[PDB]
Amino acid sequence: ARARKGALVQCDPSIKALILQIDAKMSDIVLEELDDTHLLVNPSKVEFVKHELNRLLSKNIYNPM
């Protein structure tokens, strides 16, 4: 009997690895690893990891000017 507030992040392997890399650079991101498709993340960092990940993925996309 113990509740812990947070954000449940559901995603795929590729997004999971990126979140781990972001968590390694900034420790507080990931609170706990739940499964290969779920992560518990800090509520304050939800709006930041979601915004940061898109910036990282922007490199893989070719935006013509």
Partner 1 sequence: PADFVPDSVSGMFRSHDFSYLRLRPDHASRPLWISPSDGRIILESFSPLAEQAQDFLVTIAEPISRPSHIHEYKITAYSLYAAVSVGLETDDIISVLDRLSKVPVAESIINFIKGATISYGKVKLVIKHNRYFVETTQADILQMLLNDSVIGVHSFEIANESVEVVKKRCQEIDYPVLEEYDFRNDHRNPDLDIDLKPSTQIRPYQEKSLSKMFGNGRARSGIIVLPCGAGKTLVGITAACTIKKSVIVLCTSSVSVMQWRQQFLQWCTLQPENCAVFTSDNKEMFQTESGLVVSTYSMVANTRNRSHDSQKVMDFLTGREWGFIILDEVHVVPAAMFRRVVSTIAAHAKLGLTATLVREDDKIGDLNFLIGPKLYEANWMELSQKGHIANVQCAEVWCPMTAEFYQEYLRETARKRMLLYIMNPTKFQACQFLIQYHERRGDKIIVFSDNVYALQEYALKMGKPFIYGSTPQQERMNILQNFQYNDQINTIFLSKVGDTSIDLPEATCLIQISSHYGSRRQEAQRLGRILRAKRRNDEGFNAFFYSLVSKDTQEMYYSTKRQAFLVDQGYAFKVITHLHGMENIPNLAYASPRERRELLQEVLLKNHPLIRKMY
Q: Contact residues for partner 1 (CB under 8 A)?
A: 12-14, 16-18, 21, 36, 57, 59-62, 64
User: What's 61's DSSP letter?
Assistant: S
Nearer to partner 1, 3 or 12 (CB): 12
Report the nearest approach of partner 1 to the CB of residue 5 (Å): 29
Report the nearest approach of partner 1 to the CB of residue 21 (Å): 5
Q: CA–CA separation, 24 vs 49, rounded Å?
A: 12
Nearer to partner 1, 4 or 59 (CB): 59
For residue 47, the Cα-to-chain-centroid distance in whole angstroms is: 10
Report the nearest approach of partner 1 to the CB of residue 24 (Å): 10
User: What's 26's DSSP letter?
Assistant: S
* Location of structure tokens 């507080």: 28
